[PDB]
Amino acid sequence: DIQMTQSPSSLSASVGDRVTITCGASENIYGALNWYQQKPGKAPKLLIYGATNLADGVPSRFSGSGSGTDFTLTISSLQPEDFATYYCQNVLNTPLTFGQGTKVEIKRTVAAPSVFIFPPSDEQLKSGTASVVCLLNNFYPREAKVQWKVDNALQSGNSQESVTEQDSKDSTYSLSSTLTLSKADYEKHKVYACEVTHQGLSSPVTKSFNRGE
Amino acid sequence: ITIKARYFYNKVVTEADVYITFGIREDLKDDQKEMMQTAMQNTMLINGIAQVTFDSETAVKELSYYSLEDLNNKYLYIAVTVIESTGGFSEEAEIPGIKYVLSPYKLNLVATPLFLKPGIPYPIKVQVKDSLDQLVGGVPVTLNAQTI
Amino acid sequence: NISHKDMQLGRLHMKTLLPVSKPEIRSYFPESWLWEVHLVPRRKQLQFALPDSLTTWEIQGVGISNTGICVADTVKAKVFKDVFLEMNIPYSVVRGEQIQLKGTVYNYRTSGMQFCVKMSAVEGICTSESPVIDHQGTKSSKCVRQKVEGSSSHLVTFTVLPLEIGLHNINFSLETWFGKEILVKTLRVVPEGVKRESYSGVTLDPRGIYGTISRRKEFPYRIPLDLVPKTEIKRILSVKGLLVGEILSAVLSQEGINILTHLPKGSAEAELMSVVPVFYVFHYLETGNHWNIFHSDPLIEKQKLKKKLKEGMLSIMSYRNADYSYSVWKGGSASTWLTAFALRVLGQVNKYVEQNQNSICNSLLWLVENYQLDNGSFKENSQYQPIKLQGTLPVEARENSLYLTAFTVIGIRKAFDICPLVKIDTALIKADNFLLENTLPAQSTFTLAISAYALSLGDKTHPQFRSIVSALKREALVKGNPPIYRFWKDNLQHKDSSVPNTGTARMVETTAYALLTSLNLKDINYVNPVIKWLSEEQRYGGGFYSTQDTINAIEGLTEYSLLVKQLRLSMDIDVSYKHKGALHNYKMTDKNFLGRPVEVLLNDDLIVSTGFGSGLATVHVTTVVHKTSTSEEVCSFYLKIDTQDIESDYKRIVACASYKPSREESSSGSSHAVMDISLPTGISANEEDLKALVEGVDQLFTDYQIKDGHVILQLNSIPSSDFLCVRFRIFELFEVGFLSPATFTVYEYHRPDKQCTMFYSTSNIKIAACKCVEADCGQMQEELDLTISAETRKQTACKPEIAYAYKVSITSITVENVFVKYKATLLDIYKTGEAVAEKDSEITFIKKVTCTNAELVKGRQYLIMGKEALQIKYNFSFRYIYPLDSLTWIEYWPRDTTCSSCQAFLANLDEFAEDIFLNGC
Amino acid sequence: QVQLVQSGAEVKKPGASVKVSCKASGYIFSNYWIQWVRQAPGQGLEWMGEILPGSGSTEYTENFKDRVTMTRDTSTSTVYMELSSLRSEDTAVYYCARYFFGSSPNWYFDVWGQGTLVTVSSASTKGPSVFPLAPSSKSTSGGTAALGCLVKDYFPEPVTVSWNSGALTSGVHTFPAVLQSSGLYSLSSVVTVPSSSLGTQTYICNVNHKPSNTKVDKRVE
Ligand SMILES: *[C@@H]1O[C@H](CO)[C@@H](O[C@@H]2O[C@H](CO)[C@@H](O[C@@H]3O[C@H](CO)[C@@H](O)[C@H](O)[C@@H]3O)[C@H](O)[C@H]2NC(C)=O)[C@H](O)[C@H]1NC(C)=O
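^ inputs. structure came back:
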């Protein structure tokens, strides 16, 4: 029937920047659109309704433009309360729909990633599971390149990564990689090397661990 | 055949049992007609709509005159009666007639008097209409003739 | 052995080919508009607004000129609304009934849509909620938002309940995202109990030309004993300037000609009566040459009233059969009686409007040669019995044949000049002789009077006729010396002197035929008391009790006004209340005597006074009231009615009656009779069941109709032997609660004076009762003792709202029409209000039966403090009644027993008792 | 006033129907619709359905049609939710909200619930194993060295981890977990110190798993 899409997925915003987020629908809803934001792990609060009007307890820093099948949202200056995920909705036709979400890029900067290497332990190899852990700390933007070297073997699909959200101190991300292998395939090799390639890092940094010394 | 039972304006009837009957009629001003012993039955109208199909050959020939051309310029009378399953309300409706027409086309002479003049070429201007009394062009036309 | 499949298939097979078909149409198209004709000089414009209908209006046009005729291209205009809201409101609802109103919201929109509907609470209706929010700036009823699909229709209901009588305004708000739309609707709230009308007339002749001078009359304010609480009395006053002025006003003052009675229109008789007022008005206008009354063009009104006349005459043609015989009901067996009556109608109308002579001749021939006996008496064809006559079976059949013969003689005599004929004259001599020599053995004054008039329209020189005249003159009844009033009754064994002073349809009929006989014999000194009686016996609508009496009575009045020359009308009239102030004063002349009927607004004894003047002024006051009981009335019929349940399955209703003849009457049963069943609020009936009880050879009733939520049937006769029952299914239209009982009435058509009325209902149990169910009705404190202390009872007792505080004992408990009447005897007085409460008198209390909070125990002593002391006047005495509110105090009183808690309770109670008996406050 | 109570975290098998309810308090219960919505983790949210208390009127999304059941109780002013034949990928965070229909073109989602985290049962319940991650001698260049502990093969979530029982509140980072192929998670918790402070000091990594009732201590050297 009627449904809408939200754009963009993300945008870079400085603390004092000016940003815009839009969405658009199947059929013209006239003035039927609503905007709201959600802080992580919490219930979202209503911000704009009717695509124009401001809710009570909602500051004037939030502006929006509401006519037709296409709808826009305008923030002139970001605030510490403005870092969250955002969503747009239509209230008109019987099947209420929603948008695909918006991520906020908190800081304008280019950071330098940290590369650490963590081999398994003595208590870890007693159950038959060896996990090779590669660590990246405090970089930006969120996208990073983590490449595995076990004696000329790049193992992808038997390793599982994880991404941590921004550390509010410096407003930059962190990432980990847990390579889960057995203890039978862990002893076939010797030299372990993890390679990290980043946007703010020209030379990919490789950290190694030696077996048999 | 599609039948629609509704209440007021757009309000549809929910549950209905519908019974339909047919007959062969000579003309539209005759208050009697030849009814047909075998008629469709017990079709439940759901959401204000019911549909049936009627075989003229099957429902006529064994009961009555058995050739498709024998019904020409003779109409088909339809009688529908609808009962409401929930409330027991019963109502009737009918179509007085539907004309059986052999050929979809009907012909008539135009601008061609019926008197021929000796030695002059005789024009014959023929006109082709449909069952709606509307002109239909591009129709092939064959003229056979005999002179005495 | 068949299930329900073939059961309906059978009736579906037999619906067709047994009958040919029936004429009728399932759709209705109202009066067309834009019928005007105009002269257009190449340009014109006419602006107006469309009606509200969802319709494709095809507007087409035609025009002509010296060139010729031209068909304008048909213009297509379709009135349509994509979002439209329909609202179903019932005809009438009685206060106290919890009633949901259902309504349908429709949408033609391409796709689905969601909406809201707001109820506007008007100040006299509890919404079970009272949703109106005045807390914030803009007040609203809130809403329940509901959805509907595209091109769909959804139902929405609202549950409510009335308080005030006749609160006519409720608004409905339809709100979509596009905006709002307003629908205003009206609610009829009607009083409970039953309607009853009391008629008080008076005639004004300050000169006393006609045998008495009357300059004044007093109609008091009389409150009925059983009158419904919180219901005021209705009074209507009509002042007209001639004996027939009220009839003329009935025709002219109200543009549409109103039915003079509330009798049903089913019979061919009732269709014949519809032309009577127009006819007699026309007679007085043309014969006396009184047309000068119109300030507008007189001749235009002559053509208009003439046209109304002809239309009213052709009104009854539908009941004429193929032989020009007139049947009492459509398609039924024709009756000599009604055919003769219609022959009288057309016979009188043929003077000013020429009817078909051939049809008249054929009709006369049909009744004359078709049904007549060898002695000249006439035999009735159909099973229709016009009236019930006194005497046993031989006397009743003889008297009945006499009445029929006199009736048909009247008819044929009235119409004879249109088709004078040898044969019909011969039969006229036959029946005239039969009347002459078989009437003198008189039995009832009814038959003697009708025969006297029938023979009065014939040869007037017969000595036997003058003997019947002398006997009927012997049977006269007179009020006052010298004669003031004169009239007649049924005098057989009734020759004792009794005048209940109650107008009887039969009585008015008898005295009417007597009067007409006098007018044709032209004895004037004998007449004036009679017209004095009938002119004051008339109603506001110009009609009398029944049809048969009203026709002959009106003809008598009119011919009287046309014989004795009317006097110039000059009067200064004023009406005023006795103790209260003065009301509108009528200064009445020959120009405006037709002035508005005025309803008496105030409740007071009414008095009408007139100055010195000439003429004859009719003043009639009719009084509409409601009351809660039939126990006072005179019931002529065994009545029983109840509701069953069947095995889809529905609810069933069955009513039953039997005739209770008087000692003079025989066991042969009743005459033409009518059964009215009032349907309770929000429940209809099955048309098909009645239509089956009517339309076939086994018909148990001659005609049925449903009028304003009333199921009315007509029947030839009601047997005195056993009960007869009508039975039909019923439908619940919407959920109702605490519904009030309705009326079931049965009466004779030609004499409604014999009737019986009854209350009935579907069924009753307790509802739960939570939201606004009890409206300010009652509260009762708990048994034994509470934290309640005697000095708090001093606060509430001496409260200025509370007039009286005393304890009494229960005497009797009576249930009358949803209202509870408690008889109680007083025990100990503390402080009394404006009403005097004597020791141990039997007083009364009222209760609304829908309140399960406060209830009373048989014979147990209670402490009561009432706020209000109510009074009622009988004009010889004033009786007190005590209302029971939710602000009134009720506490249980134990007797002397020692329960663990009893001592302290009697201590608190006696403490308060002597505290207030000290006149402490 | 406006109060909406949300149910507790439920864990049920892949295809066993799960129940979550919402309580309404402070307003007129049957006069306003109640909406149910689902957020799949880390991505957009999907509108699920609505219900009219006291009219019982329901409508659902056709994707989840015949997976969903809404019921109403006016006694406790509560609305119940049941999901049958769901699976592991359905499990997500679910919320209730109140639809406020304004008397003008103002239509809100007004008051919201606290949310219910619903999770699928994988290998029922299992306790965490905590394996050290030690630094090296030659891999730390001059200013920086990292040391930590790994919590692996546990179920269900969450796992609350501390350092010296809350003595390090700054400079300590911990990574959210990731699902293995056995129905278990791997999460890492580390701290960064200079090479000299790493050499001599005692850092004890405390691992507290409440749902599985387990604590594991780690000596990092
Ligand atoms: C239901 O709808 C009716 C529609 O008639 C509305 O009634 C409105 O009531 C107001 C009362 O203030 C009326 O205004 C008054 O007008 C008189 C002059 O006629 C003025 O003297 C007063 O001071 C006052 O201004 C108004 O005319 C009337 N009709 C409208 C607005 O169309 C109202 O919306 C609803 N009423 C009820 C009783 O539910």
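Residues C 120, 122, 169, 171, 184 surround ligand 1 (CB under 6 Å). Chain D is about 0% helix and 50% strand.
thumbs up if we can close this ticket
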